[PDB]
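Example 3.2
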Amino acid sequence: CXFXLPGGGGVCXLXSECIX
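Structure, written as tokens:
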């Protein structure tokens, strides 16, 4: 997250907002 905007603990499509 954010979904599309790599914030803190995720990349665009990579993390809990997508898979994880």
